Ligand binder design. Structure first.
Ligand SMILES: CCCCCCCC/C=C\CCCCCCCC(=O)OC[C@H](COP(=O)(O)OCC[N+](C)(C)C)OC(=O)CCCCCCC/C=C/CCCCCCCC
Ligand SMILES: CCCCCCCC/C=C\CCCCCCCC(=O)OC[C@H](COP(=O)(O)OCC[N+](C)(C)C)OC(=O)CCCCCCC/C=C\CCCCCCCC
Ligand SMILES: CCCCCCCCCCCCCCCCCC(=O)OC[C@H](COP(=O)([O-])OCC[N+](C)(C)C)OC(=O)CCCCCCCCCCCCCCCCC
Ligand SMILES: CCCCCCCCCCCCCCCCCC(=O)OC[C@H](COP(=O)([O-])OCC[N+](C)(C)C)OC(=O)CCCCCCCCCCCCCCCCC
Ligand SMILES: Nc1ncnc2c1ncn2[C@@H]1O[C@H](COP(=O)(O)OP(=O)(O)CP(=O)(O)O)[C@@H](O)[C@H]1O
Ligand SMILES: CC(C)CCC[C@@H](C)[C@H]1CC[C@H]2[C@@H]3CC=C4C[C@@H](O)CC[C@]4(C)[C@H]3CC[C@]12C
Ligand SMILES: CC(C)CCC[C@@H](C)[C@H]1CC[C@H]2[C@@H]3CC=C4C[C@@H](O)CC[C@]4(C)[C@H]3CC[C@]12C
Ligand SMILES: CC(C)CCC[C@@H](C)[C@H]1CC[C@H]2[C@@H]3CC=C4C[C@@H](O)CC[C@]4(C)[C@H]3CC[C@]12C
Ligand SMILES: [Mg+2]
Ligand code: NA
Ligand code: NA
Ligand code: NA
Lengths: 985, 34, 264
């Protein structure tokens, strides 16, 4: 399909669509076309049916292994029923319980996933794409859905293309065609026809592409699903790709624990077959042990944590593309933030002035009177002329009946403030710009750090060319040899140079952005009236200009930035300020927002205080530094590490867009998880290279929003503090949940080992093994995901991903060596109590295994001389199994309470987790019902416990609680000691 | 007269079921508390 | 993994052997020693609450079970050959060892007691009534060395499980009937299957020293005509209502089933 306007001239473009190349179609015509055609939105394809996700939840994770468990239970019951009349139904109830557990876990996971996906999808639409269309001559910001066929849009650097554009006028436009071509190299867009194939010609935009640099104007030819991106089956945005580090940790832990569980199950199965177990009993024991050791409730915990994080991100107006990436934000140890738009409100106004070698003051807002200095000054007239002519911003459509301070604007913040000030203390900028015709302009970019404009001269003097320039005050001053004083031009000498330096120190030390302005009267002989100026060619002399003055603009820091930065620094995060502004302004803003704390001084400050040269000062004497961008260009890789290592408070100034990426690589080379908060187009590579990238939701560019992983819709810097807190909370809750599930494994495998070794009657059977795993390790471990953050969650240092993992030797050591062993001891004590109270003293139990389990020996003698039949002592053994299960619930009550916190006491973190209390009550009620319900002695071989047998495990539960409380007390009182080195997981 | 070989199982099961039901109800109530 | 056990560097055997390993081993040793001390003390406190004369609970063993003696090699199946002295040698040896305390020479210390009356003992002496082996005719050692084997008439002792403080009401009696169409003759040498009340109640191993539980001997008279035939013998307690025998969950509660197979 190759039928476009790429090869058509501008003559037939207007006739075909009826839209002016400059003015464009009117609002009424646009409304009629929209009502005739429709919105500019792709039709969302339904990816998967709802119950296909349900089946994925049902058969995903360990749930499949539990499915084989249930199928094996049913098959064993079927074999028993076919073989022996009136067989035991334990296998039938066991398979039914396993299937019910799988179904309940699957539906709970599906419900939580559906809630999370609904929150993400509903909250994702809160950021609507915006298009800069042109209608009725004026230009206004209009939603990208309202774009139709015929209208012309003004797309600039950092803005995604709203639809297919037939470009008719471009000024250094380059776009990112990675969707079609497959490369990130920008492709220059120019109106001239180059290639017969539209895909190769460079006068057409292909929709869903990012304009890297420059601005262009073109008429929409294709909209909606009729675009080139619509034709291909592959979606333009596609799906996010990549495995989150926390997901990798989960996967590795699951693999290791599953391997261990399978090995233990197979070993126990072989050992049981050795010890005269029937095949069906051995298979059921195999599946019981394997199900017991695996943490099949872990995935539901992860889903619950993710859903809670989605809840808490939605209320803070944080848009997270991938909910697992919040853990990376919690693990962040360095934050790189830019000055304009992130640490500042980005609402700047003209405040101070400097020309004619004196600092003037101007009212930022609501002057309501004449300007303090004379408007008749020739220097002021020239400065205002340069500011008006070089500005690219223009006022919005139909806003001529409201005050200028409230007028909306379309350009950058700096140009907006310049336009507002010139309107306030000058004439009408529209007619002033119409007076001076525009010939050629070079759009501002961070590489050159200046903007150039060429205008004709209609005054009494007629050079016919005005070379007005605006940009960084220092860079342009190096290109100027003359300066205009009181309307008279004089060569620039050292006196005026250092006068400018001290003046800018005065202005720059107040946290104010400053721009420089120059103009040049090009000679008639060099360039006639009929002269063509190329942007690629130098042509006119760019240097040798005439300096005029400075405009100093107040740009206040955002209100929440100081407290948020303080919290970030108190959380162990090093906040690095990287910007393209002057070191003086950057340092002033850093001190204002708290990047450079009071008392801390730079090497230059130390030298100034000591009157010695800066080279004399030892660099290590200063913990804060301001690295200039020019020095970073010739700065080697090794030297970059020294500043990022020795200095605590680093500020980067006059940095190019690529230098931000260089700093990001340098910070990451030190094994640090960096967070980059960039909103402009100049931060595109840093956002992608950073571990976690943050983009502003209002003022951020479309490319930055695409590249970022997290978007702040409220433009609140405290949202970053919230994000790191919630990542830390996710990690803490997952670690707490994993520890609780692991402790139960030792109580479930120890009875069989002791059975084999000491030849005592079996303390725990398969049914009670599965009762411990399902009853105590599902709802309680999930409820540990609802645990609120500890008091000191934001006071601890960021976790090191190398040394600190989700599961480490200290977690395994804790859960297996200490808590699991105490639980096993409690279960064994209850076992011995019951067996002794019925007549079998503990010494008599050694070696009874052969006689106890013999179905034909029906005179087993206890310590008191009584003789027991096979069934009579089997009832006692099954009562021992039931009480072993009950004793494990009592000890697990303490384990759930101690897991609730990692360093704090349960007294400090109160029992405000109602899900956990519910889990405790439900597991206790389940134990009581299993023990005391009639018919359980036939259904599952569970028999009632006498009232005093419930308290046999109380001393061990109290021991667990007290030992953990005193260990945590030692952790807090003596930080960094042996106890924290080994026990703190 | 107390008799060995006999235990009040029915009373024990009735009290155990009552306590299990009470714990079940209290767990539901604490869960939906507000 | 690779290496991780190398002697150089501070990391030896996944850590510091000299300091880290020693300290962690010491901590585990102290922790497990304290745990073992707590477990031992807790069991000691539990055992202080128990009585060495009578078990705390006896509701799990409310009715006695019937068990045969000697125990065959596989599942109460007496397989023997009259021509092979080694086939039934184990049975003869086990019967001789079991019936040694029942001989008149061994039990001269025990006292004779009046028959037909339950003999209750409140006194702390707790004398034990004597059981004369002569009541088991043709199934004792005096009649012949082998207990009826090698002649086609094996003897099987049917003993009743001992329960402390059990007082069987009425007149207990163990009756044995052959399920093999009553072709063989089953003989119980005590009259009918009577078990005297003077032996009950049992007062435990600690207090009731030298107890001799009542015994029942059954001879399955294998005729010379039939050889290589297997006979099932069903025995149960009949005359006492206190002793339950109609139970489906337990196949040995006041009841026993055993099979005898004679060869050649
Ligand atoms: C992994 C968990 C395993 C848990 C079970 C351990 C294995 C148990 C197997 C066999 C032990 C059988 C019992 C041992 C004692 C038999 C002798 C005895 O009957 O003893 C008597 C003493 C004092 O009684 P008495 O004469 O006053 O009572 C008389 C009261 N009347 C007269 C009323 C009856 O009773 C006492 O001292 C209590 C002696 C208890 C000794 C326990 C030693 C084993 C403990 C191990 C726990 C270790 C934890 C750390 C594990 C680390 C693994 C790497
Ligand atoms: C095709 C179409 C198919 C449609 C199928 C539809 C079927 C079902 C739909 C799902 C229904 C799920 C209902 C139960 C989940 C539930 O409604 O939960 C809610 C609670 C509390 O919610 P919240 O406080 O977060 O809300 C806070 C809200 N805000 C933030 C606004 C304040 O969450 C909790 O209670 C968490 C409790 C977690 C533990 C129980 C669940 C998982 C346990 C499994 C173990 C199974 C038993 C094993 C032991 C026994 C073995 C014998
Ligand atoms: C009588 C029959 C047998 C008795 C009954 C059954 C007993 C068997 C009990 C289960 C054994 C499971 C042992 C798991 C050990 C840990 C392994 C693991 O996955 O570690 C993860 C970890 C992986 O962690 P990683 O790779 O994340 O960390 C690597 C380290 N850094 C951080 C530097 C990258 O394992 C390792 O590689 C490191 C730890 C050492 C592993 C070896 C430990 C000792 C193994 C002893 C095995 C004894 C088996 C006895 C069998 C007897 C049969 C007759
Ligand atoms: C007859 C005796 C029978 C004894 C049976 C014992 C049963 C033991 C049950 C398994 C316990 C271990 C579970 C491991 C789970 C690991 C989970 C995970 O993701 O780990 C990653 C983590 C990764 O942690 P990490 O990355 O922090 O580790 C790096 C280590 N540093 C920091 C020091 C460099 O690995 C672990 O935590 C591994 C723990 C070590 C396991 C030690 C096992 C010892 C052997 C136990 C007994 C085996 C039988 C011996 C006797 C045989 C006789 C023939
Ligand atoms: N529209 C414009 N025309 C001319 N010069 C401009 C301009 N906008 C900014 N400048 C100058 O060029 C520099 C732009 O550098 P850069 O774009 O890297 O940083 P920045 O001004 O965007 C602050 P931040 O990094 O926080 O966004 C500024 O120091 C400013 O003085
Ligand atoms: C009672 C018998 C049959 C089984 C005993 C199992 C014991 C000895 C095993 C099972 C799990 C093991 C622990 C697993 C993990 C660690 C962490 C490691 O850094 C030190 C050793 C330590 C603490 C192990 C010590 C030995 C251990 C406790
Ligand atoms: C929910 C958690 C925190 C506390 C639960 C305590 C429960 C498990 C314990 C403590 C005291 C115990 C009770 C003690 C006495 C009796 C009377 C008896 O005739 C039936 C059992 C019964 C009723 C026990 C049932 C279990 C019991 C209620
Ligand atoms: C550890 C220190 C500080 C306190 C020790 C508390 C011990 C002595 C207490 C607490 C719980 C108690 C047990 C609770 C339950 C039973 C079962 C009952 O049928 C006999 C008493 C017995 C066995 C108790 C023995 C004594 C006991 C173990
Ligand atoms: Mg920016
Ligand atoms: Na487990
Ligand atoms: Na589990
Ligand atoms: Na657990």
């Amino acid at each position: 399909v190759s039928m476009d306007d790429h090869k058509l001239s501008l003559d037939e473009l207007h006739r075909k669509y009826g839209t002016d190349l400059s003015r464009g179609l009117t609002s009424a015509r646009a409304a009629e076309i929209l009502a005739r055609d429709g919105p500019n939105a792709l039709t969302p394809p339904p990816t998967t049916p709802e119950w296909i996700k349900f089946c994925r939840q049902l058969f995903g994770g360990f749930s499949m292994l539990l499915w084989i468990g249930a199928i094996l239970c049913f098959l064993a019951y079927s074999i028993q029923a076919a073989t022996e009349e009136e067989p035991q139904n334990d296998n039938l109830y066991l398979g039914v319980v396993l299937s019910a557990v799988v179904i309940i876990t699957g539906c709970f996971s599906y419900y939580q996933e559906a809630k999370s996906s609904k929150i993400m999808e509903s909250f994702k639409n809160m950021v609507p794409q915006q298009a800069l269309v042109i209608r009725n001559g004026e230009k206004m910001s209009i939603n990208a859905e309202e774009v139709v066929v015929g209208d012309l849009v003004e797309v600039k650097g950092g803005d995604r293309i709203p639809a297919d554009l037939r470009i008719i006028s471009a000024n250094g436009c380059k776009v990112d065609n990675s969707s079609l071509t497959g490369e990130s190299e920008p492709q220059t867009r120019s109106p001239d026809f180059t290639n017969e194939n539209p895909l190769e010609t460079r006068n057409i935009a292909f929709f869903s592409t990012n304009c890297v640099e420059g601005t262009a104007r073109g008429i929409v030819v294709y909209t909606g699903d009729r675009t080139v991106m619509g034709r291909i089956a592959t979606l333009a945005s596609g799906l996010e790709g990549g495995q989150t580090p926390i997901a990798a940790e989960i996967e590795h832990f699951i693999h290791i624990i599953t391997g261990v569980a399978v090995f233990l199950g197979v070993s126990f199965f072989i050992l049981s077959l050795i010890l005269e177990y029937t095949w069906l009993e051995a298979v059921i024991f195999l599946i019981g042990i394997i199900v017991a050791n695996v943490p099949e409730g872990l995935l539901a915990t992860v889903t619950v944590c993710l859903t809670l994080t989605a809840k808490r991100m939605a209320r803070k107006n944080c848009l997270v593309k991938n909910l697992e990436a919040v853990e990376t934000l919690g693990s962040t140890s360095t934050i790189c933030s830019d000055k304009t738009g992130t640490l500042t409100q980005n609402r700047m106004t003209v405040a101070h002035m400097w020309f004619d070698n004196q600092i003037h003051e101007a009212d930022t807002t609501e002057n309501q009177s004449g300007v303090s200095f004379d408007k008749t000054s020739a220097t002021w007239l020239a400065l205002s002329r340069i500011a008006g002519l070089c500005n690219r911003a223009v006022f919005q459509a139909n806003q001529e009946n409201l005050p200028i301070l409230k007028r909306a604007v379309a350009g950058d913040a700096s140009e907006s403030a310049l336009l507002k000030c010139i309107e306030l203390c000058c004439g009408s900028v529209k007619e002033m710009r119409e007076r001076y015709a525009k010939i050629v302009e070079i759009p501002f970019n961070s590489t050159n750090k200046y903007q150039l404009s060429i205008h004709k001269n209609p005054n009494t003097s007629e050079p016919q060319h005005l070379l007005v320039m605006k940009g960084a005050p220092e860079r342009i001053l190096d290109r100027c040899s003359s300066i205009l004083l009181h309307g008279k031009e004089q060569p620039l000498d050292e006196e005026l140079k250092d006068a400018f330096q001290n003046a800018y120190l005065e202005l720059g030390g107040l946290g104010e952005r400053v721009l420089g302005f120059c103009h040049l009267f090009l000679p008639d002989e060099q360039f006639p009236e009929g002269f063509q100026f190329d942007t690629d060619d130098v042509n006119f002399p760019i240097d040798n200009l005439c300096f005029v003055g400075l405009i100093s603009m107040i740009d206040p820091p955002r209100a929440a930035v100081p407290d948020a930065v303080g919290k970030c620094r108190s959380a162990g995060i090093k906040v690095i300020m990287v910007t393209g502004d002057h070191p003086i302004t950057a340092k002033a803003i850093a001190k204002g927002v708290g990047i450079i704390s009071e008392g801390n001084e730079t090497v230059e400050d130390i030298a100034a205080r000591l009157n010695i040269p800066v080279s004399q000062v030892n660099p290590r004497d200063a913990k804060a530094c301001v690295v200039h961008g020019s020095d970073l260009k010739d700065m080697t890789s090794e030297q970059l590490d020294d500043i990022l290592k020795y200095h605590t408070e680093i500020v980067f100034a006059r940095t190019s867009p690529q230098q931000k990426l260089i700093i990001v690589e340098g910070c990451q080379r030190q094994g640090a998880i960096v967070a980059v908060t960039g909103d402009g187009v100049n931060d595109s590579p840093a956002l992608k290279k950073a571990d976690i990238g943050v983009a502003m939701g209002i003022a951020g560019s479309d490319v930055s929003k695409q590249a970022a992983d997290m978007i702040l819709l409220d433009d609140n810097f405290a949202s970053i503090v919230t994000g790191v807190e919630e990542g830390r909370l996710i990690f803490d809750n997952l670690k707490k949940s994993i520890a609780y599930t692991l402790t139960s494994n030792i109580p479930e495998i120890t009875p069989f080992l002791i059975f084999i070794i000491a030849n005592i009657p079996l303390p725990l059977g398969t049914v009670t093994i599965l009762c411990i795993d399902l009853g105590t390790d599902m709802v309680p471990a999930i409820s540990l995901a609802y645990e609120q953050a500890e008091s000191d969650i934001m006071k601890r240092q960021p976790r090191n991903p190398k040394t600190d993992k989700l599961v480490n030797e200290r977690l395994i050591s804790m859960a297996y060596g200490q808590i699991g062993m105490i639980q096993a001891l409690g279960g064994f004590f209850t076992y011995f109590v019951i067996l002794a109270e019925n007549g079998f003293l503990p010494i008599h139990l050694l070696g009874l295994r052969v006689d106890w389990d013999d179905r034909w020996i029906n005179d087993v003698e206890d310590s008191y001389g009584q003789q027991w039949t096979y069934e009579q002592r089997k009832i006692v053994e099954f009562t021992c199994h039931t009480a072993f299960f009950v004793s494990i619930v009592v000890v697990q009550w303490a384990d759930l309470v101690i897991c609730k916190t990692r360093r704090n006491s349960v007294f400090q973190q109160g029992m405000k987790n109602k899900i956990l209390i519910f889990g405790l009550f439900e597991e206790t009620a389940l134990a009581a019902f299993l023990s005391y319900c009639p018919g359980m002695g036939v259904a599952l071989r569970m028999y009632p416990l006498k009232p005093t047998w419930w308290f046999c495990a109380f001393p061990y539960s109290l021991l667990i609680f007290v030992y953990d409380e005193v260990r945590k007390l030692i952790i807090r009182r003596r930080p960094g000691g042996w106890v924290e080195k080994e026990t703190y997981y | 007269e107390d008799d060995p070989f006999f235990y009040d199982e029915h009373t024990l099961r009735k009290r155990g079921l009552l306590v299990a039901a009470v714990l079940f109800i209290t767990g539901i109530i604490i869960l939906t508390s507000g | 993994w690779k290496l991780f056990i190398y002697n150089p560097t501070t990391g030896e055997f996944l850590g510091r052997t000299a300091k880290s390993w020693g300290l962690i081993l010491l901590f585990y040793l102290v922790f497990y020693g304290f745990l073992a001390a707590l477990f031992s003390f807790t069991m000691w406190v539990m055992l202080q609450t128990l009585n060495d004369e009578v078990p705390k609970y006896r509701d799990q063993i409310p009715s006695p079970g019937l068990m045969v003696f000697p125990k065959p090699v596989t599942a109460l199946e007496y397989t023997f050959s009259r021509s092979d002295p080694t086939s039934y040698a184990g049975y003869i040896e086990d019967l001789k060892k079991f019936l040694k305390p029942y001989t008149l020479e061994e039990q001269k210390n025990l006292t004779v007691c009046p028959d037909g009356a339950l003999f209750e003992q409140k006194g702390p002496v707790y004398v034990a009534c004597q059981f004369p082996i002569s009541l088991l005719q043709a199934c004792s050692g005096m009649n012949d060395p082998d207990f009826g084997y090698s002649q086609g008439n094996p003897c099987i002792l049917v003993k009743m499980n001992r329960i402390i403080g059990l007082k069987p009401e009425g007149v207990p009696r163990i009756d044995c009937v052959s399920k093999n169409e009553d072709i063989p003759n089953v003989a119980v040498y005590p009259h009918n299957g009577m078990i005297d009340l003077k032996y009950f109640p049992y007062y435990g191993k600690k207090l009731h020293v030298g107890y001799l539980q009542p015994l029942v001997a059954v001879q399955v008279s294998f005729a010379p005509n039939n050889t290589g035939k297997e006979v099932t013998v069903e025995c149960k307690i009949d005359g006492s209502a206190n002793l339950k025998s109609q139970d489906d969950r337990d196949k040995f509660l006041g009841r026993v089933m055993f099979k005898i197979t004679a060869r050649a």
